[PDB]
Design a protein around this ligand. Structure first.
Ligand SMILES: [Cl-]
Ligand SMILES: [Cl-]
Ligand SMILES: [Cl-]
Length: 201
């Protein structure tokens, strides 16, 4: 019946469709791992909400679990099925969402890299090579494994071993392999903007 035994509030949020973009990003599905949004129970989650965007104005937050889209159950829908349902022409986009909490210790860190200075960290994970979380093998998250005092992260001090990496310079690492994440972390300029939450501290 899809209502409403959860400890988190379930709300039906409508988004006006007047030609503009949704201004939201989703992760998860029936074929995608959604850590750290779906640990106990997997599903479709909103990973990113653009500021001053349509979703932001409507009241959508990061970490919201999408239960239904215009009446259609999307709890066990494919990622592409969720996308198609959101981008589907309708008078009013109705979203049944549950207010699941945002990832623990979610914070955006900015790190300055001096000229000729490396970042000085090693990462573990993630997709197609799950190893980042040895305690939770099913997790394809990307974690910081080592932190060198010589690098920019050591001079910063905010990065520590165990933190989960979510975004690197406005690019989600969710679903990416180890090599793809390394490549993104190497291709950054003198400024590293990373979305970080707690991992296996
Ligand atoms: Cl619109
Ligand atoms: Cl529209
Ligand atoms: Cl490095």
């Amino acid at each position: 019946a899809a209502a409403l035994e959860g400890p988190y509030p379930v709300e039906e949020i409508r988004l006006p469709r007047a030609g503009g973009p949704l201004g939201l990003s989703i992760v998860g599905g029936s074929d995608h791992s959604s850590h750290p949004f779906g640990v106990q129970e997997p599903g479709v989650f909103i990973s990113k909400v653009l500021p001053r965007g349509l979703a932001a104005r409507s009241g959508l937050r990061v970490g919201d679990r999408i239960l239904a889209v215009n009446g259609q159950d999307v709890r066990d829908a494919t990622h592409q099925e969720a996308v198609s349902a959101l981008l589907r022409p309708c008078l009013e986009l109705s979203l049944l969402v549950r207010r699941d909490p945002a990832p623990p210790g979610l914070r955006e860190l900015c790190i300055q890299k001096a000229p000729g200075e490396r970042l000085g960290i090693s990462i573990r994970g993630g997709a197609r090579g799950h190893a980042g979380n040895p305690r939770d093998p099913t997790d394809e998250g990307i974690f910081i494994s080592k932190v060198s005092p010589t690098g920019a992260a050591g001079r910063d001090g905010r990065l520590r071993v165990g933190l989960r990496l979510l975004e690197v310079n406005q690019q989600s690492l969710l679903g990416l392999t180890h090599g793809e994440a390394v490549q993104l972390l190497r291709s950054v300029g003198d400024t590293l903007t990373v979305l970080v939450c707690d991992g296996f501290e």
